[PDB]
Amino acid sequence: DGTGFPELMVVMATLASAGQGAGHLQLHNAAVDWLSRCKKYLSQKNVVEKLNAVMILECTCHIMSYLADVTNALLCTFTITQHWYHCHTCKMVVGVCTVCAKVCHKDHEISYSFFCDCGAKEDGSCLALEELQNQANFSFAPLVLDMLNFLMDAIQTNFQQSSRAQQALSELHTVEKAVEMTDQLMVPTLGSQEGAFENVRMNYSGDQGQTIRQLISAHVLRRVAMCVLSSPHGRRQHLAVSHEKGKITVLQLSALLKQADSSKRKLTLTRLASAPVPFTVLSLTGNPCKEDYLAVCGLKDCHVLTFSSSGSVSDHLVLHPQLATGNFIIKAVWLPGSQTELAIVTADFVKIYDLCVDALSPTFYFLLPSSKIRDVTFLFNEEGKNIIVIMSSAGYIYTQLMEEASSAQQGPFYVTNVLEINHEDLKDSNSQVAGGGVSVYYSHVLQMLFFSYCQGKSFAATISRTTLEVLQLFPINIKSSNGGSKTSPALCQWSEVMNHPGLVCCVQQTTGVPLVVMVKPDTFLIQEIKTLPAKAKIQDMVAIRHTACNEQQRTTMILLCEDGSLRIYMANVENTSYWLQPSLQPSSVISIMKIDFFEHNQQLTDVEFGGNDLLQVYNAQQIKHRLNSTGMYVANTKPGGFTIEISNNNSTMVMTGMRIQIGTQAIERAPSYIEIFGRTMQLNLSRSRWFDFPFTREEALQADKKLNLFIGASVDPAGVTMIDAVKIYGKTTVLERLVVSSLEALESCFAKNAAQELATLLLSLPAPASVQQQSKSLLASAYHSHKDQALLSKAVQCLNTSSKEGKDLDPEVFQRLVITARSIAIMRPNNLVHFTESFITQLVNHFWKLHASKPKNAFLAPACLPGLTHIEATVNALVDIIHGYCTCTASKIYMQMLLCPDPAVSFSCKQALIRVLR
Amino acid sequence: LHMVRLMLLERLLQTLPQLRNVGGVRAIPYMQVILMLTTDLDGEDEKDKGALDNLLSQLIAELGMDKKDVSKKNERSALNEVHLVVMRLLSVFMSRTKSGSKSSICESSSLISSATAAALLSSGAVDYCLHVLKSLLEYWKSQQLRQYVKGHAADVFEAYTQLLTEMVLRLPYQIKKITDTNSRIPPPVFDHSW
Amino acid sequence: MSRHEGVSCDACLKGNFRGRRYKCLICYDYDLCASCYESGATTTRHTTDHPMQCILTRVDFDLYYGGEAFSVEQPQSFTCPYCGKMGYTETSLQEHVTSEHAETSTEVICPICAALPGGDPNHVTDDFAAHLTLEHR
Ligand SMILES: [Zn+2]
Ligand SMILES: [Zn+2]
Ligand SMILES: [Zn+2]
Ligand SMILES: [Zn+2]
Ligand SMILES: [Zn+2]
Ligand SMILES: [Zn+2]
Ligand SMILES: [Zn+2]
Structure with missing residues (x-):
């Protein structure tokens, strides 16, 4: 009876607590017997096979956890005679020079033609001149050991339930895919009311407008109204939206993406400065490598806009596609892993521009032998060269390597190489493969080519990037839930959600209903995104993976409806997290390792002194005048003091500091304190004097054109507070529970060679970032010696085995070894050198081997990630280890690391060696 | 530890030709x-x-x-x-x-600075600096460390000619200041041409 | 001490109060003392969103406007009765109202007449720019 067994077990534990306070072996023995009985049942190998294909297993886990808890319980200018200063502490207001202020009056009250009086002084003042535990440790601990041992086969099976990611990718490429329809990939969370965006419906009209309508109706052109501008490198999550007025609006998404859990709150999209384009905007394309760049295309025009951090247009570049007679710009494509390479695709040609070199002349100029261009995608071969793939209107897929031979230096280049694909659905008729071609897309992350035809035939294929041959072909069949729609809709607008491998988006060419596809190594999960009501025809969709308030990289899909409403869908983590599982993700512990102020400033002019508490009594000019006039001052009877608002009207200057003069009229009417940038400064003055306040680099950025100065109340019984002057200065699972319980129990019992060997096996055995943490806790002078010996001996064994079988050490395994060694190189470098003893050389050799396999570009990198997750951190760690050895070939290794063309390698090495010297 | 750091620096300078x-x-x-x-x-x-x-x-x-x-x-x-x-x-x-x-x-x-200045002068480095300076002046006529890292965050030599000029404005100047502080080492002799 | 004679606070009812007199430019004959103003006192006729004109006693004038020679109790900081902005002079106020509030026909009390001694304090005008050009330019 698994149901109820854990609640009864918790009542048993509470009664044990009773006897624990006062009693003799209250529940300790019975609980040992319960562990024995749970082992007896599981030992049923028939039940083990059933689990491989559960209540008793949960009972065992609970008993083990309880047992673990039980075991746990068991010179001066005078030298020469300038910027002079008053020392209030020494009552010199007489003055001191800059040096004397910092030397003879160091830590004194100091306020910014003269002769230092400090030095003038000949006094020499100027220096600038129980039974339960016994039973648990009697035979219970061995009992647990033998239990885990005979259950180890089943335990290894449950553990199974970079290398894995490679295997999964391999399966993805080789194993047949089942197509399943689901409604659980994306779940609706938030939606805006009708009209949130005014004028999003582009009412095309007039000669050019009629042409556009005809082209959209003929499915030759499609409008892309929304684009997300959030590069992985950048942090400016933003949304660009085009409007019927041909105006581009940039919105801030950070507020919207955080209100994901908001039960009943209006969608919030902060508007930024817009973007000016003198044409009807048909497509928006952001640069994934640089989130500031936006390509804006009309029918014949292509503009590249650069946005500042505030969302305003900083730069505007206009391209010249030189379209043929009757030709038009279909779209603009930023070449993968590039910031300047921009391809312009037309029905007649494809021109590729390097915008860093030349915006007028294309670097590449491609033409087809016949037919028209319906889609163009770019792939990077194992060599690293871009290979253009072109879908023709006739249904042929053309491929061409981008090299000097195919360059536009000699004029237009005719692409003749056709990717050969043979399928029963692919029967070319009247020179039209399955009715002709529609769309082509290559996923670098999945290393798969997606393409679709006019007759609703869509395929995913694995291609050899060297030979450009199709290796495996997988059909994507969409079954319309609505009856009578036997004909399959054609697919278009293929895209992958950035930083969410396997989640692919596309749209039916005719219907225009977005589809979300989760690609797994044996299955295509497909969800059709419907509208409630359908009246809100979906105009465009954008998917983005963002950091949630819980730091969860949630994948949000934003839909723009024709009526101007926004609808937001969220990815269901259970159905969309296959490639994001820590088992497939390259989880790495290395990640955890990873007074003269006013002399150089100038008093600002035209600064607006407009404190609201003073605005009611004095006019703006008066305030300025009084604060900048002697004998004149500003007063305020408001209890608690008042706020002065300072506005910098000079956009070329930054406020870096402020000086305030107080006490000239009456000391009792001087403010007691001031608050600026959240800092409270006490004003302890006995005579009229100035107070200096510099602004920190960060505060200088905060006080660029606006500054709020809070003035505290004076000690005047009448409540009068006075300021004499203000000067501004500036410059220009069940398995999880089971393993947790067992390993906690083992660690408590241990609190040794065989125990270490058991943990070592558990370490080698697979884990989804769980058993590892458990084995970590299991492991947590004689002690340090044993511990260090065991870890280093294993590290040496792992490095030797990898060297002998000629196999590159697993990046994660390698990084674990490096961290372990590093920790010891710090705790006991002597132990590090003695136990390991060749070791340093092996580490460094493997580092270079893994570094050489490191992916050239993250976007191009596939689901499996070779190389090292954190080279910098790794380099830092290696330097600590090498240094630890030297304290108790290495120099050559240091020189090699410093020279590495890869900058971070040497720069981090630089930092590591500074720390070792420090 | 000091001795091992010293021998590390020695091996570094020994492989230094490679740089x-x-x-x-x-x-x-x-x-x-x-x-x-x-x-x-x-x-x-x-x-x-x-x-x-x-x-x-x-x-x-x-x-x-x-x-x-x-x-x-x-x-x-x-x-x-x-x-x-x-x-x-x-x-x-x-x-x-x-x-x-x-x-x-x-x-x-003080000893370190004195030794540096003496060694630099023994190689007639001041004359070489004067030569490179006349060369950069002719270049101008034709036209007619971690501190740098902070100033120039791009970490690109940028105007090497300016850096070269600025660096000599510094090395021989330091030489003269050190030859004045240490009387044992004589300050560089400058004639009208200099 | 100079007091706001004939001026009772409409919130706490302390008549002839001292300190800064606060007069509502929307509510007819509505006045607040400094304490009630700072506390954000509201009534059925008055809300905190109503622009208010600060009026000083002579004594306060000499204190607040101390160190600079001015006319006896000469109001020099005016509040826009439409938007509530402050620190306006008879001229800058006119410019502001003409520029930003030219199309507004809401009845308001003239802050200049109210603040200036001898001027009709409860003067009500739908077009404030009219006073700014014919009576208070
Ligand atoms: Zn001095
Ligand atoms: Zn002092
Ligand atoms: Zn001094
Ligand atoms: Zn009152
Ligand atoms: Zn009111
Ligand atoms: Zn106004
Ligand atoms: Zn008036």
């Missing part, structure tokens, strides 16, 4: 490491003093004071960038010869 066309920017970290090691080659200890003198001799062999390729010195080159790195290292070395918060460190720092 030539590697690129000064890629080698910023290496010369900065050399500095960190030197920040300990102080005291009145003469073993450390001779290690520092051997470093200075390596830097002089690198420096082209003897070479009369003043034109090639004007033309930005790997060698020119390496010479600029050597000058920046020498400046960092002589720039910490102050007496502020120095527990007998002033005595060591």
